[PDB]
Amino acid sequence: FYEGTCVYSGYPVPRGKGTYFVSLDDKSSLFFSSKYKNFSDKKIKAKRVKQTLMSKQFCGKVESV
Amino acid sequence: PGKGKQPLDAIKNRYGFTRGIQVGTVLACADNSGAKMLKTIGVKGVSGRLNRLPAAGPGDVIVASVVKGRSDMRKKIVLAVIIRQKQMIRRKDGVRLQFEESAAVIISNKGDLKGTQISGPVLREVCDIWPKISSQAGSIY
Amino acid sequence: SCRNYSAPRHGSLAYCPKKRAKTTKPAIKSFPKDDASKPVHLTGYLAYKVGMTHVVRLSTRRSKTERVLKETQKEVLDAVTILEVPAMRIFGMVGYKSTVNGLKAIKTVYAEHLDEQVLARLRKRNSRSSKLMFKLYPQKYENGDIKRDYELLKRESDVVRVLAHTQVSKIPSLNLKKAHILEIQLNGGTIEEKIEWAIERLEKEIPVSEVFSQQDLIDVIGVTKGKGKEGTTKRFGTTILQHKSRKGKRKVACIGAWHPANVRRTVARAGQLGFHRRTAQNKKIYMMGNGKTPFSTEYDLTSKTINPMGGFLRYGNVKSDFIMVKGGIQGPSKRVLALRKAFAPSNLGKDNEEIVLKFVDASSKKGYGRFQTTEEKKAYFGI
RNA sequence: CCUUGUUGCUGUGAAGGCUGGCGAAAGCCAGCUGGAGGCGGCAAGCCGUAUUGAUCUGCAAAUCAUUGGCGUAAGCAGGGUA
RNA sequence: GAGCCUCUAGUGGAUGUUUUACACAUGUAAGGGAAUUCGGCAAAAUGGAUGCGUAACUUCGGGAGAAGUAUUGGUUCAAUUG
RNA sequence: CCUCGUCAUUUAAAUGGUGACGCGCAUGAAUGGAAUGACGAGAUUCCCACUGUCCCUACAUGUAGACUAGCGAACCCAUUU
RNA sequence: UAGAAAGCGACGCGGCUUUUUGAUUCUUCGAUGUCGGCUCUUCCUAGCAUGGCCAUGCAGCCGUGGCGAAGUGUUGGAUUGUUCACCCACUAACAGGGAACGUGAGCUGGGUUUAGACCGUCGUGAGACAGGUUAGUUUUAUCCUACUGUCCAAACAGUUGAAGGGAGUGUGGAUUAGUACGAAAGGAAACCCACACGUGACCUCUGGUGCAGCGGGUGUGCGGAAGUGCAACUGCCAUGCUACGUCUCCUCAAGCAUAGCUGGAAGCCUCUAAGCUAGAAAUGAGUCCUGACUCUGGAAGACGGCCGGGAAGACGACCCGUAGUUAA
Ligand SMILES: [K+]
Ligand SMILES: [K+]
Ligand SMILES: [K+]
Ligand SMILES: [K+]
Ligand SMILES: [K+]
Ligand SMILES: [K+]
Ligand SMILES: [K+]
Ligand SMILES: [K+]
Ligand SMILES: [K+]
Ligand SMILES: [K+]
Ligand SMILES: [K+]
Ligand SMILES: [K+]
Ligand SMILES: [K+]
Ligand SMILES: [K+]
Ligand SMILES: [K+]
Ligand SMILES: [K+]
Ligand SMILES: [K+]
Ligand SMILES: [K+]
Ligand SMILES: [K+]
Ligand SMILES: [K+]
Ligand SMILES: [K+]
Ligand SMILES: [K+]
Ligand SMILES: [K+]
Ligand SMILES: [K+]
Ligand SMILES: [K+]
Ligand SMILES: [K+]
Ligand SMILES: [K+]
Ligand SMILES: [K+]
Ligand SMILES: [K+]
Ligand SMILES: [K+]
Ligand SMILES: [K+]
Ligand SMILES: [K+]
Ligand SMILES: [K+]
Ligand SMILES: [K+]
Ligand SMILES: [K+]
Ligand SMILES: [K+]
Ligand SMILES: [K+]
Ligand SMILES: [Mg+2]
Ligand SMILES: [Mg+2]
Ligand SMILES: [Mg+2]
Ligand SMILES: [Mg+2]
Ligand SMILES: [Mg+2]
Ligand SMILES: [Mg+2]
Ligand SMILES: [Mg+2]
Ligand SMILES: [Mg+2]
Ligand SMILES: [Mg+2]
Ligand SMILES: [Mg+2]
Ligand SMILES: [Mg+2]
Ligand SMILES: [Mg+2]
Ligand SMILES: [Mg+2]
Ligand SMILES: [Mg+2]
Ligand SMILES: [Mg+2]
Ligand SMILES: [Mg+2]
Ligand SMILES: [Mg+2]
Ligand SMILES: [Mg+2]
Ligand SMILES: [Mg+2]
Ligand SMILES: [Mg+2]
Ligand SMILES: [Mg+2]
Ligand SMILES: [Mg+2]
Ligand SMILES: [Mg+2]
Ligand SMILES: [Mg+2]
Ligand SMILES: [Mg+2]
Ligand SMILES: [Mg+2]
Ligand SMILES: [Mg+2]
Ligand SMILES: [Mg+2]
């Protein structure tokens, strides 16, 4: 069982962990931890954070769609 | 129970979430009635203990005064329902939520809404105990 | 003069004086009422605290008066504690007699062969002994002293209890070579039946499945975590004083009036906190199982043991039988606890409901645990 | 009262001066030069507002920390004399 | 001749123990933001230089750094103080 | 003095602040009277920003403190408490 | 609305209290720190809410007068140095008091009440004024006793229970039900579920903290790079600790006020004179914490130090290990 997939990191989230953040734009979004939520606020682009699943796919280190 | 000025006739069950909003808190108004900002002066249902400030969560009814809005409406006392909150909440299923900004919506003594449209997202649990809010909210979460 | 505003007291006087417990192992001091109408059964056991995890269960509990038509079912997430319970071994019995001064012990009788683990409790320092402990007692079997002893117990007794020890050698993480010994009461039938039931079982092993089953309510007795000497702010919960005060803010300001000219026992003072005996009533058994047989739910079709990835932090892996119970339990990992059948049955609706599990969490307790098995980790990373 | 010692860095830009424009005149407007003041921010120093802070069998029969006021001058100081 | 870091030249002892509570010098804090208290006391916030833009009143000197806003590192070039 | 004077404004709420009024216990003209500018570590009220002052406390650092070696006092004292 | 007495009760008369202010001067002038607030504990009842009842000008809803009862509650703010007062908001309700006008080697220092200075009124003046205004140093426990924990009196293993402590309180929703009751308008009465305050524990989750660990930049040192000192800044974060997180809290017996049964005195009557039944958040026990004197057992060796650890800790004490799934 999973809670979902983290918006910023790309990481799958275990049941009973993480949090949803809801913006006034009306969108609901899931984050793995406080670490990656804060990186969003500070406008760090995910592709530069080299341990993320997003970054690894973009570089072609991991096979993706 | 109905005592004093501005009594409430339409009591409902509380949920046990954390209480982010307390006396002194200024918060936005979400409806189209013409008020813009509300200043919290009291909470319904609170019996109190020494040195503690009264506090509320989503679904609770607050007493407030209108500090921004149209001229006919300012410096008057009014009742409102809390629809979203910036402090974190935990559902009994274990899911946790947090909104970007807190807000409330104005009601009559009988629990009827003052306006006709509500800006932005609203918490699911509120729509379970205040059914009229479901009709005119932006999105439900 | 009377004080200006009303307020409640700080802390409960039901637990004063709050002194330190004498030793870490508790005796069950009170047992539920006997009833001659039922078969002979045991009333308690010993267990070791492993650690905590969480589970998801299905529920359907609602007000009987709620007018909703649909049979609503809902997921609930709950925290649970795991206890390890290897089989205890029976090694003797005691009879008691009722007097104007309460219960008094008549005689104690021991098995012919006793284990090294139990003899080790009788000496103080383990590695320095001549081991001439029980070596002359076996003659009493030849002499008929045992047969005279049983006669006296059977003739003159009101209450009968067995002596049992735990097999510490099965739990290596304890670093312990002396067994723990507990006296456990027998309820049901008559004195004669109780004595015969006991005699049949000296030297043998009783599994936990004799005493408890799933969904049962039980009482847990233990000693809490220790916290050393502490001030009034933490020991009794009193408020901190004004920010600009000289001579310290974390204290009670006034400790009495002029008369009486002494300090009362009801005023808060600094001292020991923690390491006290406490009993938790009516906790419910969610599951019973074994540390090395995998299990599954109707919904989670993975097959896994109770052990999380990397084990529990300062314990490792469960190997024997285990019980799982709702909520938190006294003391740190590795402490001994006493389990008892509930003293009286509960009327509360939250206690008497069924339990149906759909998921149990097995992720790592060190750091953020993000996989449920080694197979998932090997699949997420390469190769 | 007599004889001596002690002004480093910066801001603002008075009087006086030179060009260009406007005006019938009187004299108005720009840009630059010049460097006045018991005039501003600071340094070395001199002082003593707050914390009713520390200390109160003190380091000390009046001290210490942070925070403050003035610092191109009815400013601070040694010796001789009344 | 500020604070911070180095060269020349000069420098130091009541012993061991990881050491509860309460202190005295300091750090950080979800949501709320003076509700605290005689009283925002203490703390936080603002901060240099460059440009844009600056009110009432006034003894016409001032107010004025009014207020309010934007910019600032490394590298490689043009141009010569912009 | 009566007095927390009356009316307006500031707050949800004003023994406070500012604006008006005046038979002023007992205002008033170098015993100096009245209206402003620039300047006060002077007294007082409000707003914006900001915050452990507070709700309601939690965790961590240095130095003392506990225990130990060497050195080694005083206030006070009818005392049986 | 009839009517002394549901509720009131003129004109008069008898008491109790010490929480107001007087009256008096017995104790202290080789010194008992003086108003208010903050903090914290206990007691009283003349009962505001919450539980059981009786009367009614008690239809129902809301009330009013009385009885046994002190277990649990009685709040957040604006002006003011205030106790007091007066308003706003919440509430089941926002009762009244005592303990050297409780509480300064517990704090604070706004008021009053030393020495500076202004104003008004009084005085020829020096000066006065329970008139107004502003600035004005809060010392010392290391003694005895109390109180809170700690060891010994009490070899080791298993227990017993004398006596002392004590704990859960309240609100709402749904259902009965738009029912009974009332001309109508209005409008009640268990069980179950949600919550708040209080109590005791716990870290699986989520916040917080950053001592161990990994990274980044500014000024200046070790010829460069690499490894790095000092001034200190900054992003993440194990274990642990913590609340803004999670779990927790009823059952008997004897009986108060009352309302009843049988029943004489007193052929009738009658709750009482003997005897019996129902009876409160109150009382006494159990479940919960502390643990006096005891009781049962093994064996010619036992136990303490020294050495090494922690789940325990101020120091002692407690839990453990020493030729082994021992340590490095
Ligand atoms: K962080
Ligand atoms: K008092
Ligand atoms: K007991
Ligand atoms: K100049
Ligand atoms: K001082
Ligand atoms: K010294
Ligand atoms: K130099
Ligand atoms: K320099
Ligand atoms: K204030
Ligand atoms: K005040
Ligand atoms: K102060
Ligand atoms: K002019
Ligand atoms: K100005
Ligand atoms: K007034
Ligand atoms: K006013
Ligand atoms: K006059
Ligand atoms: K005059
Ligand atoms: K004159
Ligand atoms: K001044
Ligand atoms: K420390
Ligand atoms: K020391
Ligand atoms: K005197
Ligand atoms: K005083
Ligand atoms: K009553
Ligand atoms: K009471
Ligand atoms: K004092
Ligand atoms: K003692
Ligand atoms: K012996
Ligand atoms: K008792
Ligand atoms: K945790
Ligand atoms: K943590
Ligand atoms: K150096
Ligand atoms: K964390
Ligand atoms: K009875
Ligand atoms: K008792
Ligand atoms: K012997
Ligand atoms: K040791
Ligand atoms: Mg208070
Ligand atoms: Mg501590
Ligand atoms: Mg002080
Ligand atoms: Mg963990
Ligand atoms: Mg010069
Ligand atoms: Mg000057
Ligand atoms: Mg200097
Ligand atoms: Mg001077
Ligand atoms: Mg002062
Ligand atoms: Mg904060
Ligand atoms: Mg914040
Ligand atoms: Mg206050
Ligand atoms: Mg200040
Ligand atoms: Mg004021
Ligand atoms: Mg005026
Ligand atoms: Mg005059
Ligand atoms: Mg008196
Ligand atoms: Mg004295
Ligand atoms: Mg005397
Ligand atoms: Mg005294
Ligand atoms: Mg009474
Ligand atoms: Mg007093
Ligand atoms: Mg005192
Ligand atoms: Mg004063
Ligand atoms: Mg004076
Ligand atoms: Mg002064
Ligand atoms: Mg570190
Ligand atoms: Mg090993």
From TrEMBL, chain A:
Domain Large ribosomal subunit protein eL24-related N-terminal stretches: 5-64
Family that this chain belongs to: Belongs to the eukaryotic ribosomal protein eL24 family.
Name of the featured protein: Ribosomal protein L24E
Included stretch of the parent chain: 2 to 66 of 131
TrEMBL record, chain B:
Pfam families: Ribosomal_L14
Entries under SUPFAM superfamilies matching the protein: Ribosomal protein L14
Record-listed Mg(2+) binding positions: N51
CDD domains: Ribosomal_uL14
Keywords, ordered alphabetically: Metal-binding, Ribonucleoprotein, Ribosomal protein
GO cellular component, one term: cytosolic large ribosomal subunit
GO biological process, one term: translation
InterPro entries for this protein: Ribosomal_uL14, Ribosomal_uL14_sf
Any one Gene Ontology molecular-function term assigned to this protein's record: structural constituent of ribosome
Family: Belongs to the universal ribosomal protein uL14 family.
Name assigned to this protein: Ribosomal protein L23
Species per Swiss-Prot/TrEMBL record: Spraguea lophii (strain 42_110) (Microsporidian parasite)
From TrEMBL, chain C:
GO CC annotation, single: cytosolic large ribosomal subunit
A matching Pfam family: Ribosomal_L3
Keywords: Metal-binding, Ribonucleoprotein, Ribosomal protein
InterPro entries: L3_arc_euk (IPR045077), Ribosomal_L3_dom_3_arc_sf (IPR044892), Ribosomal_uL3 (IPR000597), Ribosomal_uL3_CS (IPR019926), Transl_B-barrel_sf (IPR009000)
Coiled-coil portions: none
Biological processes per GO annotation: maintenance of translational fidelity; ribosomal large subunit assembly; rRNA processing; translational elongation
Residues annotated as binding Mg(2+): K365
Domain of life: Eukaryota
Molecular function GO terms recorded: RNA binding; structural constituent of ribosome
Family: Belongs to the universal ribosomal protein uL3 family.
Name the record gives this protein: 60S ribosomal protein L3
Originating species: Spraguea lophii (strain 42_110) (Microsporidian parasite)
Biological classification of the source: Eukaryota, Fungi, Fungi incertae sedis, Microsporidia, Spragueidae
